[model samples]
Each structure stands twice: as C-alpha cells, then as structure tokens.
Target: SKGEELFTGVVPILVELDGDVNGHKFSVSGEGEGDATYGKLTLKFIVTTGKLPVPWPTLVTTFLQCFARYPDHMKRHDFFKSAMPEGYVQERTIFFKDDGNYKTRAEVKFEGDTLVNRIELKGIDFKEDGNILGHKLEYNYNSHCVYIVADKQKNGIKVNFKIRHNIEDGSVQLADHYQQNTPIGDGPVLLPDNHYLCYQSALSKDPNEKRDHMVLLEFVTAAGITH
Candidate 1:
C-alpha cells in the first residue's frame, strides 16, 4: 500500500496506445506536456512496492507479459558446472545468455533480501531528448538487482532501460511531434528531419507558451541495489 501511494498517480494506458503514443504500463503527469508524435520513448523506474509473491516465481508469468512486444533467449553456461537436469536446465539457469531468455525473478533477486526492484528506461530512441525513442535496449542484469526492506515506505524498487526505433510522418507522425498539456521531460519535437532539434529551440519553449516538444518514458525505478 505504501508504494501504491507513490505510484497512485500512474494510470494504465489505453490498450491500443503505441509505445511511441505514450507507454502502456506507465503514466505521465497531466500538468506537463509531451510530443503528440514521439520518435522514441523513455522509461523511468519509480518506486513499486507490491508483495512480489514468495519465491518470486509467482510473478514470472505476470512479468513475462511485460515483454509481450519483445523477444526472449537464454542458454549454455560454464561457471555453473553441474549436471543440469532435463527439467531444471533452463528453469535453473540464471543471467540468461545474450539473446536468450528473460532474467529469472530469482536471478533478479539474487541479492538475498526482500529488496524492491525499479527500472528506469531513459534515452529510448538512442537519440537524446531522453525520450527512449528507439527499440534497441540495454537492460543488463549485472547492476539492476534489489534486496527490499520490509518497511512499506522503503519497499520500492528500481532499474533502467533504453530502446531505439524509427518513425517517419501523419497523425501518428504528427502525434510524433506535438507536446501539449502533459508531464514529458523535453516538450516535443516535430518532423523527423530536424524536428528533434528545431522543436526544442522553439520560441515558445523559453519557460512560456504552449510548449509541444517532449519525450515518452516507459519505466522509472526505485530499488535496493548497489550499482
């Protein structure tokens, strides 16, 4: 319930919303404005403090759903040196091989504590604007782990992600640029050719007028881990 209060501001986006149209599982402050047509999206890891079912496996399927639009891969190992049972092969492997599988909840919680895990996806498009506009991402598990404390107030978690993708033009393309009343960091950038830059330097951007250029964030993290 503690983390709930912190993230209560977040809303489940419309099911049809494109990652560029505004993320699906994340939310933006209505007070700010972002691009109507974003070339990319960023995700900031805010504190999430729900009881991640014991053994954490309970959240496996639930978490997998998050990757509905992505891919998975994981195999082979040397340090693990041991006979991997037929049933335990993948089920037991952690830190999936590159282009392998999703990081197991256990491997993600290897810290051995009840730590909350948070993920912040910044610079998505691989283009600045901090919008995470791209599809390619770097979610390396090496530093993104947690050991949550039982205290509800301190129960949040964190992590970071980045993606790279492309967008050309249209309402979807126009949505790709206009940043009106919302909470996006950069306002908005119009027209792919030079919009990324031209929009930011708009005469209306200097702390006045209806700013439109902005970025979409996917995740924000709050966790107990040493990066």
Candidate 2:
C-alpha cells in the first residue's frame, strides 16, 4: 500500500507481463501512459491452434486502456476510508519535506464548499534500521474530527492501529473495545520524561476485559508505544 498518510501519484509507474495462458500467449506492456494515478494499460493475447509441435498463430489486440488522475494525497486517504469526496480533483500538491526516505505532505481543496485537508508524514522502511515507519493523519474542520493511523510489525504480525480524536475530548482507545480513563489522582498514566514522547492507554495491564468501555489516553510520549 506504500504505507502513506497522504498522496499516491508521486512518481511514474510501469507494468509488464509475458506468459502462456490456457495455451495462449499473453503479454502486457505499459507505463504511466494516461495519468499518474491510473494510467493506460496495454495487453496482447496469442494462441496456437494446431496439432503437435508449433501450431498456427492466432492473435488478438485492442483489449483495454484506462487511467485516472488523482492527487498524491489520494493514496493515503483512499487506503483507509471506504468513502471519499465526489468528483475530487487535485488542483495543487506540495511537499513540506521529502528526502527520498521520508515524506511530509498535504493536499487541500473544497469538498462542496467545505475545506478538506489531509496531511501525512511517514518514513521509508528500507533503511529504518529496525524502527517501524508508517503514520497518516487526517482532519476535517467541519466535523472537528481527526484520524491518525499507524502500524508496525510485532511478533512477526502486523500490529495496525487507528486513532480517532475529537477536539471535544481526549480519550484513549486501543486495538479493540478496551477503554480507560486517566484522570488525575489515579497515578501518572503518562510516564514522566526521560523516556520522552509517550502515550498511555487504559488497556495497559488490563485483564478480564474489565476496562473495555471508556477508552482514555493517560499520557503521550515523543517515541513511546506502551500497552
């Protein structure tokens, strides 16, 4: 999925295939022909209609070619959301910062008079040196809702998570329906600095599904992922 918070059509694309299908030779060749996001595609089908060795050559062409254009932000937004703005088009795109391995990007426009913004920042996994690299952020001013998605590989399994925080409240929810409240006098839910940039979830040390109701964020750390 390219694991992006926003944007997709950032670079060129290509597709090539050559093989025999049901005794028929098939081939496809094309690159970002039409547009960046969904470009044109080319294909060829050939069959051998004869007896033993090399049969007669039967060819077919003019199959399908189609492509669609979209802002790079579409890559991240579409990945998680089943519904998106209609007739959305990318009028402009900008990169706040990009170093080949990491990207911080944003896309903006009006969604039927409502401003829509999707911002993303993620690192390339290739040279992460063991640190997980994926995070996406989206916010809708009209609804005052925000969404942040991040994931990493743990125990050989992909541990994915999505965070939905409304400006009205600050609660912490995790993997499932587990919910917790980090009100003061309940001890420091968010650990002190030194560890730095950490967040606390109510599900921590929670068992018997007792605290599976009120999701809360006890603390937040700079680089901490606590259970």
Candidate 3:
C-alpha cells in the first residue's frame, strides 16, 4: 500500500487575477502552460473589467525580466517583508542531473526567523501502476503543485504545475475547470495530491497607496521536468 500509485493525466492550468493596479480594477482569468525545461511560460488572459495597462505578452516579458534580474527577491525581502521578531529564514537548493553543477533554489522566511518549519516537495513517479474500471493501468505523471506555509495561522499560496508524462506526449493540458470557466469561489481548493501550496504576502510602505494586486501562477511542462 505504501508504494501504490494512481493513474493521472495533465490538467489544464488555471490562473486568476483580482485587484486594483494603477487605479484600474482588474478582474481577469486565463489558462496556459509553463515550459519548465525551456523556461517559457505562456497564458491567455481575458479582462473581465478595466483595461490592461499593457498587452499580455508585454506583461509576461516584463515579469520574466524582473524575475531574472532579481532572482533573490524573496531572500532579499524585496517584496515581502518579514514580520517575525528575529526574522526567520529558510532556504533550499534543488540539484538536478544536468552537468556543470547547475541547480535551482528557493528561500522562505518564517515568523521569528524560527526553523520550526521548512520547505519540502513530494510527488509520484512519472510512471506508476494502478487500475481504472477494473483495467490495469500505468499511471503517468503529468505535473505537480507546491504549497508553502510560512505561517500556519493564515492561508498559503497554492501552485499547480502541469507537465507532460513524457517527451513525446507534448505539453500538459489546461485544467477542465478553467476551460469551462467554472466559478472557483475564493480561488482554487481541494487540488490533486500533486499540487503544492505556500504562504506569503507582499506589502507596500506607502500609506497613500490605493490599488492592490494579487497574482497567481502555475508552471507547465511541454514534456519535460526540471531535472
């Protein structure tokens, strides 16, 4: 039972944006894919109200540029400031099979800078065994999700990664819920086991700031993994 597996398919990627940006109310939603291997993320967004400051492609490019320029934004506390007394911080470096000693990493700051909790990831293998409708099935891994909770008292960020089971299978499909424009009250909930969640918030020092923005993203794999 411990090594048991389940059949799974790539679900559509879902994204929701609701907030005020530059005094404009943005209620937008989209579905797309994130290519982990090539590091290319694409999404199609629809504006429910208010006008987008820039084109979707331009916005994505700006975001990627910022992310690359400030890879240590989280570690440097550039967006989310630490409210803990001692400023607890947690960092992890994930290594892959690639050569040249390459790797990726993430840093998290907990309350009081305490080490009570750390970051972790879990998922089933790309290929596993299971049965559907009494037929033996080989469950394939599509993508995964990450959930991080810096503070147990509050809600955490939920991230879902959609990937292909194999290189030949192509990219993961967009989740059905997003395709149908299902009414996801209060964001996504009850995600599959492969999804993940984390907790964090960004703050503005200016007391005169009027608009607020919330962005949620899901990375996809056309047909590959990070490692």
- The regions of model 3 sitting more than 4 angstroms off are 1-11, 35-40, 54-58, 61-227
Ranking by lDDT: 3, 2, 1
Model 1, position 155, has a per-residue lDDT of 20
lDDT of 1 at 42: 29
Q: Give the local distance difference test score of model 3.
A: 0.24
RMSD of candidate 2 to the truth, in angstroms, is 24.2
Q: Model 1, which residues run further than 4 Å from truth?
A: 1-131, 152-227
User: For residues 142-170, what per-residue lDDT tens digits would candidate 1 score against the true structure?
Assistant: 11222112112312212122111122221
Model 2 poorest ten-residue lDDT run: 56-65
Candidate 3: count of backbone clashes, pairs at least 3 residues apart or interchain = 19
- RMSD for all candidates, in order, please: 21.9, 24.2, 21.0
**How well is each residue in 149-210 modelled by candidate 2, as lDDT tens digits?**
22211101011222332222332211111111111122211212111112232222223433
Q: Is candidate 1 or candidate 2 better by lDDT?
A: 2
In candidate 2, stretches whose alpha carbon ends up further than 4 angstroms from where it belongs are: 1-10, 33-77, 80-227
Angstrom error at residue 156, model 3: 13
Over the stretch 10-92, how does candidate 3's per-residue lDDT look in tens digits?
22334444433223344555544433222233444555555553223212211210011112212221111222221222222
Specify the highest-TM-score model's number. Answer: 3
